[PDB]
Amino acid sequence: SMSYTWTGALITPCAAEESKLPINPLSNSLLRHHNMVYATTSRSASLRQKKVTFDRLQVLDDHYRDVLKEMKAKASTVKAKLLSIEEACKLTPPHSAKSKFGYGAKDVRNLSSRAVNHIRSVWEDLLEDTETPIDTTIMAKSEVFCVQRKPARLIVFPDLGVRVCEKMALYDVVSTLPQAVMGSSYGFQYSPKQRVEFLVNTWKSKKCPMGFSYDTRCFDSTVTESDIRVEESIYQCCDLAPEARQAIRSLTERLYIGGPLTNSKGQNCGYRRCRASGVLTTSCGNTLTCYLKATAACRAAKLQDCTMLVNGDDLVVICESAGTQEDAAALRAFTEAMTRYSAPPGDPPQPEYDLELITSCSSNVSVAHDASGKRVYYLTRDPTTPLARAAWETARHTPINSWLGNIIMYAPTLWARMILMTHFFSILLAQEQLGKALDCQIYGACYSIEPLDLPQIIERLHGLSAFTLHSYSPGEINRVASCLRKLGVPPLRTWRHRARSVRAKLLSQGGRAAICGRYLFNWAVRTKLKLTPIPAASQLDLSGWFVAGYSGGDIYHSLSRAR
Numbered sequence: 104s105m106s107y108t109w110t111g112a113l114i115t116p117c118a119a120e121e122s123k124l125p126i127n128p129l130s131n132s133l134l135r136h137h138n139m140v141y142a143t144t145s146r147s148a149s150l151r152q153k154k155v156t157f158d159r160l161q162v163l164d165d166h167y168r169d170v171l172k173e174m175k176a177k178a179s180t181v182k183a184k185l186l187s188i189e190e191a192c193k194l195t196p197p198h199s200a201k202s203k204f205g206y207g208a209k210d211v212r213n214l215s216s217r218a219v220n221h222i223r224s225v226w227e228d229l230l231e232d233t234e235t236p237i238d239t240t241i242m243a244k245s246e247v248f249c250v251q252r253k254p255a256r257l258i259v260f261p262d263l264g265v266r267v268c269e270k271m272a273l274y275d276v277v278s279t280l281p282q283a284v285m286g287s288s289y290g291f292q293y294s295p296k297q298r299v300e301f302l303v304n305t306w307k308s309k310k311c312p313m314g315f316s317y318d319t320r321c322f323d324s325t326v327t328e329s330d331i332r333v334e335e336s337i338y339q340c341c342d343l344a345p346e347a348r349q350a351i352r353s354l355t356e357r358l359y360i361g362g363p364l365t366n367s368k369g370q371n372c373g374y375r376r377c378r379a380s381g382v383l384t385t386s387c388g389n390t391l392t393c394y395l396k397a398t399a400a401c402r403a404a405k406l407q408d409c410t411m412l413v414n415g416d417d418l419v420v421i422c423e424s425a426g427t428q429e430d431a432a433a434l435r436a437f438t439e440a441m442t443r444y445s446a447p448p449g450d451p452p453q454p455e456y457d458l459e460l461i462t463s464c465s466s467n468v469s470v471a472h473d474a475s476g477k478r479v480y481y482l483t484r485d486p487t488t489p490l491a492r493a494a495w496e497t498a499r500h501t502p503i504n505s506w507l508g509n510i511i512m513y514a515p516t517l518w519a520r521m522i523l524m525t526h527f528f529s530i531l532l533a534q535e536q537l538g539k540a541l542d543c544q545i546y547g548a549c550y551s552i553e554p555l556d557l558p559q560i561i562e563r564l565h566g567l568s569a570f571t572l573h574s575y576s577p578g579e580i581n582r583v584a585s586c587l588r589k590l591g592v593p594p595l596r597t598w599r600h601r602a603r604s605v606r607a608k609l610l611s612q613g614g615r616a617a618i619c620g621r622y623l624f625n626w627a628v629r630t631k632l633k634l635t636p637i638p639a640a641s642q643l644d645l646s647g648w649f650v651a652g653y654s655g656g657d658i659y660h661s662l663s664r665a666r
């Protein structure tokens with residue numbers, strides 16, 4: 104069947120759309136080539152519509168059925184809880200899309216009577232109605248990139264009331280089931296340091312390792328009605344409260360398998376028969392589906408000792424080499440099996456014999472040295488997108504601050520330390536905003552974080568070595584330098600000059616600001632300060648940070664206030 108059908112009604116914006124980076128002094132101090140930075144708009148939505156609309160031809164075999172049954176036996180060990188309305192309301196982000204039923208995210212979080220009453224009625228409707236297709240809004244995503252232009256990604260999501268019901272029925276399932284089923288292959292259970300540890304250990308655990316990333320084209324569009332029902336069959340193995348079992352059954356048929364698409368103007372836009380990007384099960388279902396197809400595809404391909412690492416549609420395989428000519432044929436056999444399963448490739452997979460040359464979750468393993476000269480492995484990425492988005496967020500107030508999430512997740516990198524930390528600490532110090540909590544996303548879930556708490560957060564996630572790395576690889580230094588020239592970002596010597604200036608100001612303030620000056624900017628000086636474990640680090644409640652993925656799932660993970 105067709106991934107989408109269209110009526111001819113347009114994918115419309117709900118307000119004015121900005122596509123060009125503003126010419127602002129603060130963003131300009133970071134990146135001068137503003138014309139290279141763009142934000143996607145609904146103007147390119149038709150180009151994406153063409154790319155995502157296609158027929159799916161899916162053929163399942165014995166290997167797929169064998170793997171599915173193994174997955175179901177592990178899913179069978181799970182007991183999942185039904186969340187109360189209040190518990191599901193507390194997981195809603197403060198700036199989540201308002202309901203079309205007279206209330207917004209703030210009403211949900213305040214447990215307002217109109218919000219609560221409507222959510223309850225949506226819940227009773229899921230219990231009673233197993234068939235009526237649930238309406239969804241289709242929007243063009245507004246995302247920031249550097250030129251060489253991408254057409255906008257399309258987001259599909261149901262109303263706020265439905266999203267709160269999704270949490271009640273499936274939050275616990277999507278949080279606990281992926282690790283129970285996929286074990287060490289589930290990517291979202293790992294902090295970046297745990298992710299690098301797993302990749303390095305998997306790589307070194309093979310006699311002659313061969314690894315590959317597998318890029319499925321338009322993964323969401325490749326997901327069939329059968330894949331979605333197969334996904335529900337795994338969910339159904341959980342011990343579930345009867346209303347949760349009904350709500351999962353009704354959500355699958357009315358929402359997850361497909362449904363009508365409505366634009367911002369309320370016009371009938373089309374019909375979806377594939378994965379919606381803006382539902383709670385998107386990350387979980389995508390991971391499960393990709394893992395099931397890849398695990399079965401490895402057996403079909405005759406790939407030896409296949410270790411998967413899956414994060415939604417993002418896949419990396421490390422296996423035992425059978426020789427270069429044999430590996431190239433087995434990899435072609437893997438792709439052919441994935442294509443039969445309705446997961447054809449975008450980028451043709453290439454066998455790799457060096458772990459550092461593999462890009463998975465848009466990151467690669469790299470090496471630096473700590474204070475003792477000891478090798479430290481860490482994850483880095485091309486800094487183009489983080490810098491273009493950091494410049495956009497400096498010129499405009501955005502609900503999500505990718506720069507903050509990039510500082511947390513990429514803290515040991517040369518670029519997050521010298522540029523991101525230097526630029527934002529300078530601006531925030533001058534604006535008396537270092538202690539103001541900001542929203543950032545970690546594994547798709549939303550968090551409210553104070554930049555002054557970064558030293559303890561980084562120490563916990565990355566270890567004290569994140570504040571001492573030096574002697575970065577030449578390939579890493581070259582990629583950074585080339586990106587700065589391309590974007591017109593000042594050279595690293597300017598960044599070191601700005602860091603010494605902000606570190607001085609931070610130290611002068613005492614308190615948390617002096618901790619930030621000490622730990623975050625010790626790389627900028629010769630007269631190094633002593634870096635001891637931060638008392639605040641051990642006390643940090645990092646429960647929920649590295650459990651599961653929630654991209655598109657409308658999840659807020661910070662604490663709710665009492666009333």
Ligand SMILES: CS(=O)(=O)NC(=O)c1c(-c2ccc[nH]c2=O)c2c3c(ccc2n1Cc1cc(F)ccc1F)CCO3
Pocket residue numbers: 295298414415417464465466482508509512513544545546547548652653654
């Ligand atoms: C796409 S996601 O919303 O599911 N999570 C991610 O963005 C995410 C972050 C991440 C980076 C910055 C801020 N915040 C984050 O969470 C992150 C990461 C490392 C490894 C994996 C990571 N992933 C998984 C992920 C990334 C991707 F490029 C595509 C798919 C995918 F699964 C090394 C350090 O940073």
